[PDB]
Amino acid sequence: KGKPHCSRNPVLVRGIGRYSRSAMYSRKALYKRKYAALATVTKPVGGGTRVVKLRKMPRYYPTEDVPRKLLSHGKKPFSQHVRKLRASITPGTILIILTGRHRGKRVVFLKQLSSGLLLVTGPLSLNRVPLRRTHQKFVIATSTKIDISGVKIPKHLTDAYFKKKKKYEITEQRKVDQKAVDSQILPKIKAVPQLQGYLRSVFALTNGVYPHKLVF
């Protein structure tokens, strides 16, 4: 019986620990740790009692079948992938949505979701952008920021919450969640001057204004 312990060497870089083999042998204390040396259900009938087999035979075989594939190793599903966020994106940053029906509009980033999508609202009282997901490769991260350390994001605002369902109406829960986040983040917006109008404005390219020259 053993409660698990963390790995006794830290990560130096990826793939290599800090301490070597004999050092990790001492830190695991293996010098004092020498050690030495389903298919059938029986069911009654009315006869007697039968041995019923589960996993019964296939009634039909396809005329041709694909062979089983070779094994691969580094290939993980999307629920297990690692989540990279750009270091210019921090909680409370202002984003510019570039793609959807709210394109060019400026929004307040809050939290990265578990699928890597950026949970965001530039508030519905300013943008008409609700609590909504965006994508970091499709948003522009400007270096203007609001401190949202004291902001309680609800724990249920997840990707399962934000997933499309199947004639669309906002539910009462989605109505009250936007209020519950807006009533908190809006006094932080209005405590820095002109940012409410800045978020009300949209981003547009004009003559002579080039994106490789403009710093955001």
Binding site: R86, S88, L98, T99, R101, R103, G104, Q136, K137, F138, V139, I140, A141, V202, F203, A204, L205, T206, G208, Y210, P211, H212, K213, F216
Partner: protein, 109 residues
């Protein structure tokens, strides 16, 4: 409400003098006249928007006459800010000198 793409010109195909490789296009982006300025646009998506006679379907919309060859920026071309781009279909040579929208959203910043 306003423009969200950079202006570029289909300056020609990737070519030597007597051999043009139609699969790669040379873009001239407005405002980019040095190879140091090209680093923003590398990897960005580029669109040749054009109109034809028969209607085609518009994503998130009703069918109209506008049609798009999509593409993306691959690398810079020369010291003077010209850029190499690759499109899904090779761009028609009738578009040489005409406008390509360079979108902003393979964002890296």
């Amino acid at each position: 409400s306003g423009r969200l793409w950079c202006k570029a010109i289909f300056a020609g195909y990737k070519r030597g003098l007597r051999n043009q490789r139609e699969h790669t296009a040379l873009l001239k982006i407005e405002g980019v006249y040095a190879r140091d300025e090209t680093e923003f646009y590398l990897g960005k998506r580029c669109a040749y928007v054009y109109k034809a006679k028969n209607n085609t379907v518009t994503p998130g919309g009703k069918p109209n006459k506008t049609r798009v060859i999509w593409g993306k920026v691959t690398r810079a071309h020369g010291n003077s800010g010209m850029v190499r781009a690759k499109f899904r279909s090779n761009l028609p040579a009738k578009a040489i000198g005409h406008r390509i929208r360079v979108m902003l959203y393979p964002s890296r910043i």
